[PDB]
Design a protein around this nucleic acid. Structure first.
Ligand SMILES: [Mg+2]
Ligand SMILES: [Zn+2]
Lengths: 1049, 49, 97, 611, 85
RNA sequence: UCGA
DNA sequence: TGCATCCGTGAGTCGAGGGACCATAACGGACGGGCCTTGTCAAGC
DNA sequence: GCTTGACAAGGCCCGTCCGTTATGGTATAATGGGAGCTGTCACGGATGCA
């Protein structure tokens, strides 16, 4: 299973994470001691949800459950036990795909990588001086212990504040002079004991309080130090903090997990002194053995911990004011601070991200992202060069290729294919045991938790092995202590289980990965997660074979579980019968809206009367073919330059891709309107709207709302809504115009929902959610109407297409089939790609892919080639050229392979009919269609809305915004002679309530006027500087007159 | 990010450098030679004049 | 282009300020007909230091350290005559280039 | 209007109240903010005293006061005797400023916590010394006269002042705390007399601290030339921003969208009304001292939040936006609203390569040109007589008639359009073009201007801008056209050149293929004889062809002047043989061995440079 | 605030509403301007027009009843046809 | 977060 | 009078997306009748 | 070409009605607050510490 960091994490929270939080919260007491409240956390209910999975997405709700615990309220003096179940909070459940539904939108919880708790030592040179060793005891939650060591044998303890001597903390926790020196070399400790005095057990708590809290008190020094490291519910090492203390310092005690042991502070000082004696290891901060990951089971444990602490303040403020008895325990627990704590984590936190649902490849990748940012991780400004590079401990755990380019280059990683996280939070990799030069591929792997660095010798999965005898190679390259070396095959210990263990699940879909560059393989893995689901997908011919596993783990593929006989198959359900209440129904969704405006259509695959197996595809998804995944189409390609139509990364396609419904996707948009409550009068949805005739009232059913199946275009009316007005401030021009022809204006105003510019399609869902029907509504709303419009988009000029090797491009021309070049059998060419971008970017694998897919086209065999071989030069060139020779041995196909030029044939011109001078490489390429279509990039504005303060035009496609003329754009016009264009762009086009009126009136009348006025943004800055206490004004230097000018008035 | 902040600092230090007059009447000069980086030359004398 | 003048007792020029080298020779030659004093040491300024020591406070506050330029301009009583670029863009007039 | 220079100075308390108090036909002025209330919760009308008051800043609606009975355009320039709101336009609210009269002086945070702390320079104190007097942590001696051991401007602790209170020396010893003592220490200064006191201390016994007296003399000399006072650095009257610069709008759900300036203004008036309440009922001095310290922290957080103390927050845990935090940052008023603005008549789209076109020409789609040139199409519709107004023209544009596209075809001819791609590194990233209406939905860009814009056809979007005035159209054509931008501004080398796909077409054309000759070694009569032989199947592209060319300016790779294989004909005529030439000397004839691909290349330069 | 598209066409409304008023009588044009508030910025009632003239009531009403009747006829008023909002 |  | 430590100042440009309680008196808008004020209708000067 | 009595329509004006709103009070005894900062790099002043 590829999703185990989400399913096993939420399963741990429902049985171990929720029980541990309620056991530490209980019991609580009052100020006097009259009654006590303790919970029973291990007997909670977790009742049934309210709505369905598909119903919660359209009703704008969350798939959540109610949490109830039994609560026993006892009293100290009077014997009474009050058992009652009290509501705790709303907990959203994880769906079957591993996601959550928050406010009708599907969301994921990205796993965040942080540092592991423990002690870490570091050699630091602050200046050109001696060698200083530092320390840092990091807990899971609480204060930090930073031990430093200066020159001349002075070890200090810093607990944010100023540093202090090591004897001050070591004596205040409770110790003797003989219990320190017996377990310490004590000759180095005499230099820090001379210039520190010699305090007793009570002569150190007073001096500790004088420097931390600057009167000292004998009772104040004990309450300050115990609350930092020794008090419960304020300092936590964690289950993994106790494990890292017993490994580094080699401690004998274990299973403490709550209180910091004072013997552990003595062991951290002893390891720091011995670092000057050239013994001990300096820890690394970028090592994956020191870096942990956490998931939904751990991140939810911190939100209930800060949510129950707010509940502890109200539970102690209600058992003291009410001095009377006979009170119910259900009124002591207020669920309001804990409901708002869970709702803030799932909807308002940064780590809960919007789920990418373009294709099943992006859904599987987004659940396995390893990001180093979040509330407790790193910062965008605090990220440096060392944290973004690849550590040598990332071999097989984190993918070195798949990472987003730009700002987050290296901070957001991806988990590898065979990687696995244990219960402690460390990434593990499987390895096969090698015994005396023989790979023992018979038993289960070892799953080493990054402990193979300083102990084991690990070989990758690329060495030639024999059939159970020995290893063929005499020099095996291995890795030992983060360095590569070639040793004997009898000296190795472990070997990798797969050659795709290093790369992730999205990089493994690229065939011939070893022939492509690592920079273009980064782009090829990112463009595969943006491919739209087509209308009829097609499986690739040069697939790697891992597409079948990624389709079943995405959750959008109906699988069988019963091993039965299929009875009834239609377009909505599949009914089988289980055998060794026997009729289950598998529902099939038809054209459901996704998050990225794509389709989630499922098609039936099986027929009636067929034996099935557990793990068989019953119904494939939208971007999924039969069994395996399918994100694009296999069509003909040719690497030849046309007449400037493929000049700089441009694509020339044919007309055959248009009328054959190739690269044709279905996009479903969703519109929203609401009949709110205006204080002047309630708004309602009517059909008789003013100033709109029969040109737009054709699809309404006398209710103001459109019908199902009506073709809407740009500028129509979906929901006709009116709004009452109470202005009554008519100008004298409109009063004279209305008095002539009559037709007195009504009190309503047309606020109908309309279709935006460049939008069309067919309406498929006109679901209306009103009150008194069984659904909750937001306050200040009478009727909520939701309109879903689906449209069928073909492939056009301006769309961005790409392949699996980073050869992205934008189509500039769609030629007919008689103008495209044609093969010597008469078959035309679909895509005419440019061969100039190939040798400059090292995209060699895309030439191996098309030449192998052309061999699979004439044979019809659908090759499955795994990456990272076999014999050198005999597995990539002679595989392609050897299989192209077999396709040429057919009696009908003799023109496929040539002896002089192997990977080339003769191509004829379509316009003139003459052959070209040189042979051209042809093949069957697998191209994808990305989400960056030409329809979403069109924006234009003449005059629209304006800003609130600066009175400048707004910015945005969805709100009719204007393009920003920034500071780099002024410097280009200032370097030109364009002074009148610069004054026009800053005055009459932005921030002038007077200059915009006269400039617009000049074009309609036909006589332009010069000299625009003062812009509004300068007068805002003039009033802001006067409010800062600065007498700033503008004057005139005219003859015998120095007067201030009034820019505002 | 380093070249963007460097370009902004070069603009504000030389934003008021406009050619206003035709001649000033100075007598100083700048001696220019062939830019030789040790053994081989990079910019010839014909490219600097 | 700037210089750090010293020994000022006749003209209101405290030792430690940065003025242009052409402006020092314009006032020294104009004071030679009367007879007075004195010395100045040349300094090399960076691209962010010479941008803040200009005659315009609007061009220096929009670049960097807005709270430091406007504090110095209010106490000294500086005046901007809108000479050069990057002021008429903020004002709303034609650039002098 | 038109101004000539901008001068900035320190605002005196008589200058701040000049902006606040306005003349009204009554006995007193009403331009003072006394209450922290903004508006009412029942109706959406403000109150008669507050930060959004109509008696101070003006009427909320156009020609309508607050109480009623004056809601017409007939009453212009009068003040209602019942309410007090002047009946005028609603645009006067963004120009009027109120003031808040304080009950205690407050030091300005820019002069105290600034660099190099000009408040502490004039007082001859330290940075921590003035910071202990302000915010009420130590006492300062204001009159140490007739005392045993006391100095001027000496800091005293809380336990040290109560010892002198038991000793009454036996004279008048005056101390002070807070900003009332700093304002008294600045008012009794000697700025005319202290300037000559520091000048005699520089020449005599300078030492290392000569620069300290020099830096102090620069601050004192600025207060005499500007005719300012040293006591104006403390604030007694606080100015108020106009209410449209702190807008309060209501969203669709009913919630109000307030600003952070309203929460910082309310903290000043709530702590000022409490200080006037404690000073009236004779409060204990430990409560009045704590109230004046919070009034000092409320104004300093209003001016520069987080400068001296801790940053105050609101409902959300982010930092509040103060008066200084809207001008200094990258998202401030200077770098986001003055140097760079969002312009009208603009748009953007993806770009595709347009071949079979020219330079200074770009592909412009029809639905984007009808929005950018919308005031130019409407003017042509009324001029041709199709419509009569804008409402008849705008309904005809959005309808989709084929006569509208014939009007748009006649408008864009000769109208330059500036194309722009972000980021703009050099000045050739903004060039003007003459657009044409093409089929599709992308901008057909020329492939020759691609190294100029640094544009690649894999997802690049370019911004479109349209000029309006007649002077802007003549500057985009004569100075910003793409045909006049061949040379780069950095070097003297051109950038309009064949780069990727046309170099490979010219390298293969003038190459040498030693296998596909098909008729090499043939003599042709001139340049035009070889072009007529390429249209037939006579010669190939790389055939060795002798061409009779009488010109001498023939450049080639590895040129030579020596004559090898000298052959002499009859009657004294000698043939001068070369590596690539064949000259008949006595020059009679001259044959050039070349390829027909080099003749097509040399013919293209002849028809382009000679017109 | 109002968009400049409604403020520009408000100025174009003055150029066409005063065009059909110049073709009327100078006495007939003076009644319609001061009544609705043209060229003064203030709306005046019917009795204030009768006190600056030497003619009493029931004449200004029937003049405006005659002025509004001739503008409704389709004669020399074809430009005030698509102004109905 | 994602494109250049 | 020179050497450490701390604090304040900067760190690319465009576009898309999503997102406690109660008692009592003062204050003010709403409702209703009276009073001119204003618009309209049919003949008669 | 204008003029006069008649018939309602409606805006202010001035009373009261009751919801709305500002103000003061309650008597066992109660007596110093929480919530993060701990992985950025470079330069320029300003203390302060010998
Ligand atoms: Mg590009
Ligand atoms: Zn009024």
């Amino acid at each position: 299973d590829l999703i185990e960091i989400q399913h096993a994490s939420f399963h741990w929270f429902l049985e171990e994470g929720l029980i541990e939080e309620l056991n530490s919260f209980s019991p609580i007491s009052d100020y006097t001691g009259k009654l006590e409240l303790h919970f029973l956390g291990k007997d909670y209910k977790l009742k049934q949800p309210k709505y369905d999975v598909d119903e919660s997405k359209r009703r704008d709700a969350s798939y959540s459950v109610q949490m109830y615990v039994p609560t026993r309220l006892i009293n100290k003096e009077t014997g009474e036990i009050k058992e009652q179940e009290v509501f705790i909070g709303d907990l959203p459940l994880m769906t079957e795909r591993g996601t959550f539904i928050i406010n009708g939108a599907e969301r994921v919880i990205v796993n965040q990588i942080v540092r592991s708790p423990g002690v870490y030592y570091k050699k630091e040179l602050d200046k050109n001086g001696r060698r200083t060793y530092s320390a840092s005891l990091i807990p899971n939650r609480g204060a930090w212990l930073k031990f430093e060591t200066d020159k001349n044998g002075l070890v200090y303890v810093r607990i944010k504040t100023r540093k202090l001597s090591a004897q001050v903390l070591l004596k205040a926790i409770g110790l003797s002079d003989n219990e320190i020196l017996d377990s310490l070399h004590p000759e180095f400790y005499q230099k820090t004991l001379d210039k520190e005095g010699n305090p007793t057990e009570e002569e150190a708590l007073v001096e500790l309080y004088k420097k931390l809290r600057p009167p000292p008190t004998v009772s104040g020094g004990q309450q300050l130090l115990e609350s930092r490291f020794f008090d419960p519910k304020r300092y936590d090492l964690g289950r993994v903090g106790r494990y890292k203390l017993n490994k580094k310092l080699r401690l004998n005690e274990a299973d403490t997990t709550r209180v910091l042991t004072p013997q552990d502070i003595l062991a951290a000082i002893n390891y720091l002194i011995n670092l000057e004696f050239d013994v001990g290891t300096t820890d690394d901060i970028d090592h994956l053995g020191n870096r942990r990951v956490r998931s939904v089971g751990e991140l939810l444990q911190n939100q209930i911990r800060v949510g129950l602490n707010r509940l502890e303040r109200i539970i102690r403020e209600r058992m003291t004011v009410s001095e009377s008895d006979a009170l119910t325990p259900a009124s002591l627990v207020n669920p309001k601070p804990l409901v708002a704590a869970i709702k803030e984590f799932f909807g308002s936190s940064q780590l809960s991200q919007f789920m990418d649902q373009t294709n099943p490849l992006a859904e599987l990748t987004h659940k396995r992202r390893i990001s180093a940012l979040g509330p407790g991780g790193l910062t965008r400004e605090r990220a440096g060069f060392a944290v973004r590079d690849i550590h040598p401990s990332h071999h097989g755990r984190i993918c070195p290729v798949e990472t987003p380019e730009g700002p987050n280059a290296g901070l957001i990683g991806s988990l590898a294919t065979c990687a696995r996280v244990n219960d402690y939070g460390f990434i593990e990799t499987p390895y096969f045991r090698v015994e005396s030069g023989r790979v023992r591929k018979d038993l289960d792997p070892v799953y080493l938790t990054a402990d193979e660095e300083d102990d084991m010798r690990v070989a990758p999965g690329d060495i030639p092995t024999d059939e159970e005898g020995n290893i063929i190679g005499e020099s095996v390259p291995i890795r030992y202590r983060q360095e590569f070396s070639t040793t004997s095959p009898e000296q190795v210990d472990y070997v990798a289980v797969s050659p795709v263990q290093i790369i992730s699940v999205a990089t493994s879909m690229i065939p011939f990965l070893e022939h492509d560059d690592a920079n273009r393989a980064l782009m090829g893995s990112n463009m595969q997660r943006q491919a739209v689901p087509l209308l009829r997908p097609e499986r690739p011919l040069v697939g790697t074979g891992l597409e079948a596993q990624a389709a079943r783990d995405s959750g959008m593929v109906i699988v069988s579980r019963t091993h039965g006989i299929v009875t009834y198959v239609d377009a909505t359900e599949i009914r089988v019968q289980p055998h060794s209440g026997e009729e289950i129904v598998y529902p099939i969704q038809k054209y459901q809206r996704s998050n990225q405006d794509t389709c989630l259509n499922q098609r039936p695959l099986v027929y009636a009367g067929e034996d099935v197996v557990p793990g068989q595809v019953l119904a494939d998804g939208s971007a999924t073919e039969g069994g395996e995944l399918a994100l694009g189409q296999n069509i003909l390609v040719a690497y030849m330059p046309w007449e400037g139509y493929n000049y700089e990364d441009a694509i020339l396609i044919s007309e055959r891709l248009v009328y054959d419904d190739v690269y044709t996707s279905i996009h479903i948009e969703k519109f929203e309107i609401e009949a709110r409550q205006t204080k002047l009068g309630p708004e309602e949805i009517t059909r008789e709207i003013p100033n709109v005739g029969e040109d737009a009232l054709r699809n309404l059913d006398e209710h103001g709302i459109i019908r199902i199946g009506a073709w809407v275009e740009s500028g129509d009316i979906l929901v006709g809504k009116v709004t009452p007005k109470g202005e009554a401030d008519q100008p004298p021009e409109e009063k004279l115009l209305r008095a002539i022809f009559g037709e007195k204006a009504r009190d309503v105003r047309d606020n109908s929902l309309r279709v935006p510019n460049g939008e069309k399609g067919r309406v498929v869902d006109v679901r209306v959610f009103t009150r008194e029907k069984g659904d909750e509504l937001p306050p200040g709303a009478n009727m909520v109407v939701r309109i879903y419009v689906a449209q069928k988009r073909k492939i056009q000029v301006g769309d961005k297409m790409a392949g699996r090797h980073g050869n992205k491009g934008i189509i500039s021309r769609i030629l007919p089939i008689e103008d495209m070049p044609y093969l010597p059998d008469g078959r035309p060419i679909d895509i005419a790609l440019n061969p100039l971008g190939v040798p400059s970017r090292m995209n060699v694998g895309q030439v191996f892919e098309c030449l192998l897919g052309w061999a699979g086209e004439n044979l019809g065999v659908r090759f499955k080639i795994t990456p990272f071989d076999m014999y050198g030069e005999e597995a990539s060139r002679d595989t392609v050229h050897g299989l192209l020779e077999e396709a040429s041995q057919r009696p009908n196909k003799d023109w496929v392979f040539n002896e002089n030029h192997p990977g080339k044939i003769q191509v004829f011109d379509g316009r003139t009919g003459e052959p070209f001078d040189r042979p051209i490489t042809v093949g069957q390429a697998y191209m994808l269609k990305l989400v960056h279509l030409v329809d979403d990039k069109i924006h234009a504005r003449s005059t629209g809305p304006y800003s609130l303060v600066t009175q400048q035009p707004l910015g945005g496609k969805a709100q009719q915004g204007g393009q920003r003329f920034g500071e780099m754009e002024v410097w280009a016009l200032e370097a030109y002679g364009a002074a009148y264009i610069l004054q026009e762009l800053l005055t009459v086009k932005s921030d002038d309530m007077q200059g915009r009126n006269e400039a617009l009136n000049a074009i309609v009348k036909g006589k332009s006027i010069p000299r625009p006025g003062t812009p509004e943004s300068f007068k805002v800055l003039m009033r802001e500087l006067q409010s800062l206490g600065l007498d700033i004004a503008a004057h005139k230097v005219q003859l015998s007159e120095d007067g201030e000018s009034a820019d505002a008035e | 990010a380093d070249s963007g902040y460097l370009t902004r600092r070069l603009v504000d230090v030389s934003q008021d450098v406009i050619v206003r007059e035709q001649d000033c009447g100075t007598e100083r000069s700048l001696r220019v030679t062939a830019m030789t980086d040790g053994d081989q030359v990079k910019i010839s004398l014909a490219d600097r004049l | 282009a700037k210089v750090r003048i010293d020994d000022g007792g006749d003209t209101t020029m405290l030792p430690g300020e940065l003025v242009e080298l052409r402006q020092v020779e314009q006032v020294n030659e104009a004071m030679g007909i009367t007879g007075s004093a004195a010395r100045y040491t040349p300094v090399l300024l960076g691209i962010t230091k010479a941008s803040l020591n200009t005659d315009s406070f609007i061009s220096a506050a929009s670049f960097q350290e807005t709270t430091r330029v406007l504090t110095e301009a209010a106490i000294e009583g500086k005046s901007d005559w809108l000479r050069g670029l990057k002021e008429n863009v903020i004002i709303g007039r034609l650039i002098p280039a | 209007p038109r101004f000539d220079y901008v001068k900035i100075a320190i605002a005196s308390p008589e200058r701040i109240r000049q902006w606040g108090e306005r003349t009204l036909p009554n006995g007193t002025v009403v331009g003072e903010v006394t209450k922290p209330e903004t508006i009412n919760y029942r109706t959406l009308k403000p109150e008669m005293d507050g930060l959004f008051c109509e008696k101070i800043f003006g009427p909320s609606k156009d020609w309508e006061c607050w109480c009623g009975k004056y809601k017409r355009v007939r009453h212009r320039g009068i003040v209602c005797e019942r309410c007090g709101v002047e009946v005028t336009e609603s645009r006067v609210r963004r120009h009027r400023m109120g003031y808040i009269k304080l009950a205690a002086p407050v030091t300005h945070v820019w002069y105290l916590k600034g660099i190099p702390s000009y408040l502490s320079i004039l007082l001859d104190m330290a940075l921590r010394d003035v910071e202990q007097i302000v915010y009420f942590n130590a006492y300062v001696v204001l009159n140490p006269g007739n005392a045993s051991n006391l100095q001027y401007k000496q800091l005293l602790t809380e336990d040290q002042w109560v010892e002198i209170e038991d000793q009454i020396e036996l004279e008048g010893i005056e101390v002070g705390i807070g900003a009332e003592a700093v304002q008294r220490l600045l008012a009794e200064l000697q700025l005319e007399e202290v300037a000559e006191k520091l000048r005699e201390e520089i020449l005599a016994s300078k030492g290392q601290k000569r620069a300290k007296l020099i830096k102090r003399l620069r601050v004192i000399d600025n207060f005499i030339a500007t005719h300012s006072q040293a006591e104006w650095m403390t604030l007694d009257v606080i100015p108020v921003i106009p209410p449209d610069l702190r807008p309060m709008v209501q969203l669709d759900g009913g919630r109000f969208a307030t600003s952070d300036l309203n929460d910082l203004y309310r903290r000043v008036i709530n702590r000022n009304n409490r200080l006037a309440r404690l000073q009236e009922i004779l409060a204990p001095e430990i409560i009045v001292r704590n109230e004046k310290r919070m009034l000092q922290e409320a104004v300093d957080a209003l001016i520069d939040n987080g400068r001296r103390g801790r940053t105050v927050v609101g409902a959300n845990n982010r930092a509040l936006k103060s008066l200084s935090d809207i001008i200094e940052g990258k998202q401030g008023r200077f770098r986001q609203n003055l140097l760079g603005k969002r312009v009208d008549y603009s748009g953007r789209s993806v770009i595709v390569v347009g071949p079979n076109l020219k330079i200074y020409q770009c592909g412009l789609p029809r639905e984007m040109a009808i929005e950018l040139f919308q005031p130019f199409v409407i003017h042509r519709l009324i001029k041709l007589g199709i419509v009569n107004n804008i409402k008849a023209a705008k309904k005809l544009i959005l309808k989709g008639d084929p006569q509208i596209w014939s009007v748009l075809e006649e408008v864009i001819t000769g109208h330059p359009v500036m194309l722009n791609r972000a980021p703009t590194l050099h000045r050739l990233g903004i060039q003007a073009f003459e657009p044409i209406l093409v089929e599709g939905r992308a901008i057909q860009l020329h492939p020759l201007v691609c190294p100029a814009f640094n544009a690649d056809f894999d997802g690049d979007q370019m911004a479109v801008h349209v000029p309006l005035s007649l002077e802007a159209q003549c500057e985009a054509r004569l100075l910003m056209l793409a045909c006049h931008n061949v040379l780069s501004p950095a070097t003297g080398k051109p950038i309009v050149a064949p780069s990727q796909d046309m170099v490979l077409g010219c390298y293969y054309l003038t190459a040498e293929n030693p296998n596909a000759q098909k008729g090499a070694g043939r003599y042709f009569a001139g340049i035009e004889d070889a072009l007529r032989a390429y249209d037939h199947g006579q010669v190939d592209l790389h055939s060795q062809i002798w061409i009779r060319h009488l010109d001498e300016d023939v450049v080639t790779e590895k040129p030579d002047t020596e004559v090898i294989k000298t052959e002499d004909l009859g009657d004294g005529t000698v043939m001068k043989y070369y590596r690539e030439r064949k000259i008949r000397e006595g020059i009679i004839t001259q044959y050039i061995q070349t390829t027909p691909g080099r003749i097509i290349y040399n013919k293209t330069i002849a028809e382009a440079l000679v017109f | 605030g109002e968009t400049p598209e409604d403020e520009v066409s408000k100025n174009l409304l003055r150029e066409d509403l005063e065009n059909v008023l110049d073709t009327l009588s100078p006495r007939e044009r003076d009644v319609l301007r001061l009544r609705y508030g043209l060229d003064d910025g203030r709306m005046k009632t019917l009795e204030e027009i009768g006190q600056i003239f030497n003619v009493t009531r029931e004449r200004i009403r029937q003049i405006e009843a005659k002025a509004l009747r001739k503008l409704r006829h389709p004669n020399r008023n074809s430009i005030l046809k698509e102004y109905i909002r």
